[PDB]
Design an enzyme around this catalytic site. Structure first.
Site, PDB file in Angstrom:
ATOM      1  N   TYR A  45       0.833  -1.181   0.000  1.00  0.00           N
ATOM      2  CA  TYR A  45       0.000   0.000   0.000  1.00  0.00           C
ATOM      3  C   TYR A  45       0.889   1.260   0.000  1.00  0.00           C
ATOM      4  CZ  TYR A  45       0.971   1.086   4.811  1.00  0.00           C
ATOM      5  OH  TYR A  45       1.687   1.313   5.940  1.00  0.00           O
ATOM      6  N   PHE A  55       2.599  11.046   4.338  1.00  0.00           N
ATOM      7  CA  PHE A  55       2.615   9.885   3.464  1.00  0.00           C
ATOM      8  C   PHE A  55       3.191   8.677   4.145  1.00  0.00           C
ATOM      9  CE2 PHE A  55       2.252  11.660  -0.789  1.00  0.00           C
ATOM     10  CZ  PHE A  55       2.402  13.021  -0.490  1.00  0.00           C
ATOM     11  N   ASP A  56       2.844   7.509   3.612  1.00  0.00           N
ATOM     12  CA  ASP A  56       3.210   6.257   4.254  1.00  0.00           C
ATOM     13  C   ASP A  56       3.092   5.153   3.231  1.00  0.00           C
ATOM     14  OD1 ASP A  56       3.847   4.284   6.313  1.00  0.00           O
ATOM     15  OD2 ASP A  56       1.662   3.778   6.402  1.00  0.00           O
ATOM     16  N   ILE A  75      -7.762   0.463  10.523  1.00  0.00           N
ATOM     17  CA  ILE A  75      -8.965   1.278  10.485  1.00  0.00           C
ATOM     18  C   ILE A  75     -10.127   0.497   9.845  1.00  0.00           C
ATOM     19  CG2 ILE A  75      -7.869   3.541  10.689  1.00  0.00           C
ATOM     20  CD1 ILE A  75      -8.118   3.819   7.666  1.00  0.00           C
ATOM     21  N   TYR A 101      -9.836   7.732  11.740  1.00  0.00           N
ATOM     22  CA  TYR A 101      -9.372   8.124  13.072  1.00  0.00           C
ATOM     23  C   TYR A 101     -10.280   9.169  13.737  1.00  0.00           C
ATOM     24  CZ  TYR A 101      -5.242   5.589  11.576  1.00  0.00           C
ATOM     25  OH  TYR A 101      -4.377   4.659  11.115  1.00  0.00           O
ATOM     26  N   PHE A 118      -5.716   5.901   0.018  1.00  0.00           N
ATOM     27  CA  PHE A 118      -4.757   4.804  -0.131  1.00  0.00           C
ATOM     28  C   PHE A 118      -4.800   4.176  -1.506  1.00  0.00           C
ATOM     29  CE2 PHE A 118      -3.554   3.897   4.366  1.00  0.00           C
ATOM     30  CZ  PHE A 118      -4.598   4.473   5.050  1.00  0.00           C
TER      31      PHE A 118
HETATM   32  C1  LIG Z   1      -1.935   6.150  13.076  1.00  0.00           C
HETATM   33  O1  LIG Z   1      -0.701   5.466  13.044  1.00  0.00           O
HETATM   34  C2  LIG Z   1      -0.255   5.104  11.805  1.00  0.00           C
HETATM   35  C3  LIG Z   1      -0.978   5.240  10.630  1.00  0.00           C
HETATM   36  C4  LIG Z   1      -0.418   4.835   9.421  1.00  0.00           C
HETATM   37  C5  LIG Z   1       0.862   4.280   9.406  1.00  0.00           C
HETATM   38  C6  LIG Z   1       1.576   4.127  10.585  1.00  0.00           C
HETATM   39  C7  LIG Z   1       1.013   4.524  11.792  1.00  0.00           C
HETATM   40  O2  LIG Z   1       1.746   4.392  12.953  1.00  0.00           O
HETATM   41  C8  LIG Z   1       1.427   3.285  13.794  1.00  0.00           C
HETATM   42  O3  LIG Z   1       2.851   3.624  10.726  1.00  0.00           O
HETATM   43  C9  LIG Z   1       3.376   2.793   9.678  1.00  0.00           C
HETATM   44  C10 LIG Z   1       3.368   1.419  10.273  1.00  0.00           C
HETATM   45  O4  LIG Z   1       2.082   1.215  10.844  1.00  0.00           O
HETATM   46  C11 LIG Z   1       1.460   0.028  10.346  1.00  0.00           C
HETATM   47  C12 LIG Z   1      -0.027   0.141  10.446  1.00  0.00           C
HETATM   48  C13 LIG Z   1      -0.657   0.737  11.446  1.00  0.00           C
HETATM   49  C14 LIG Z   1      -2.093   0.579  11.811  1.00  0.00           C
HETATM   50  C15 LIG Z   1      -2.856   1.861  11.780  1.00  0.00           C
HETATM   51  O5  LIG Z   1      -2.919   2.221  10.394  1.00  0.00           O
HETATM   52  C16 LIG Z   1      -4.016   1.888   9.700  1.00  0.00           C
HETATM   53  O6  LIG Z   1      -4.940   1.266  10.135  1.00  0.00           O
HETATM   54  C17 LIG Z   1      -3.937   2.404   8.273  1.00  0.00           C
HETATM   55  C18 LIG Z   1      -4.213   1.225   7.341  1.00  0.00           C
HETATM   56  C19 LIG Z   1      -3.058   0.269   7.165  1.00  0.00           C
HETATM   57  C20 LIG Z   1      -1.844   1.020   6.678  1.00  0.00           C
HETATM   58  C21 LIG Z   1      -1.502   2.191   7.626  1.00  0.00           C
HETATM   59  N1  LIG Z   1      -2.649   3.044   7.964  1.00  0.00           N
HETATM   60  C22 LIG Z   1      -2.539   4.368   8.218  1.00  0.00           C
HETATM   61  O7  LIG Z   1      -3.527   5.025   8.564  1.00  0.00           O
HETATM   62  C23 LIG Z   1      -1.174   5.037   8.132  1.00  0.00           C
HETATM   63  C24 LIG Z   1      -1.313   6.535   7.727  1.00  0.00           C
HETATM   64  C25 LIG Z   1      -1.848   6.701   6.306  1.00  0.00           C
HETATM   65  C26 LIG Z   1      -2.066   8.170   5.978  1.00  0.00           C
HETATM   66  C27 LIG Z   1      -0.764   8.906   5.939  1.00  0.00           C
HETATM   67  C28 LIG Z   1      -0.060   8.747   7.263  1.00  0.00           C
HETATM   68  C29 LIG Z   1       0.003   7.308   7.839  1.00  0.00           C
END
Ligand SMILES: COc1cc2cc(c1OC)OCCOC/C=C/CCOC(=O)[C@@H]1CCCCN1C(=O)[C@H]2C1CCCCC1
Length: 128
Positions: A45, A55-56, A75, A101, A118
């Protein structure tokens, strides 16, 4: 950009039809199976705030992202969206805060009331 394209053209995949999770299939996958709740799912992703301010990507960590669908590991919008995808599919999701969130956010990465974008590639999934 891609977020505006999902706003204009995406399918509302929410049960409530509140446009909280909008989807475009960008690359078609294979087979009729889609992940069931409990299944172990493997994805690549890239994600960002709708506004571009963070970004991530799985790629940042050099390995697929692995989660159990519906186990509150991700989420809500991912549990809803990834359950619609086939193996090999790439999709775009645009997600309202009530499916991510919320009003609280998740600082420092996610502000209050954030809309998220995403691109997700479903690589594989397996039953618990
Ligand atoms: C709110 O905290 C984070 C959010 C996001 C990435 C984060 C993170 O730090 C914990 O770190 C990267 C490694 O983490 C793995 C997945 C985490 C579960 C929580 O994330 C999610 O449920 C979703 C779906 C799966 C992929 C990650 N995603 C995020 O929301 C991302 C976030 C995306 C928008 C841009 C900034 C990061």
């Amino acid at each position: 950009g891609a977020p505006a394209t999902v706003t204009e053209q995406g399918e509302d995949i929410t049960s409530k039809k509140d446009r909280g999770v909008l989807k475009i299939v960008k690359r078609v996958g294979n087979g009729e199976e889609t992940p069931m709740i409990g299944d172990k799912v493997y994805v690549h992703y890239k994600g960002k705030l709708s506004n571009g301010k963070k970004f991530d990507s799985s790629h940042d960590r050099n390995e697929p992202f692995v989660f159990s669908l519906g186990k509150g590991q991700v989420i809500k919008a991912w549990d809803i969206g990834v359950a619609t995808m086939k193996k090999g599919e790439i999709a775009h999701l645009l997600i309202k805060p009530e499916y991510a969130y919320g009003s609280a956010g998740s600082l420092p990465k996610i502000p209050s009331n954030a809309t998220l974008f995403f691109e997700i590639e479903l690589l594989d999934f397996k039953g618990e």
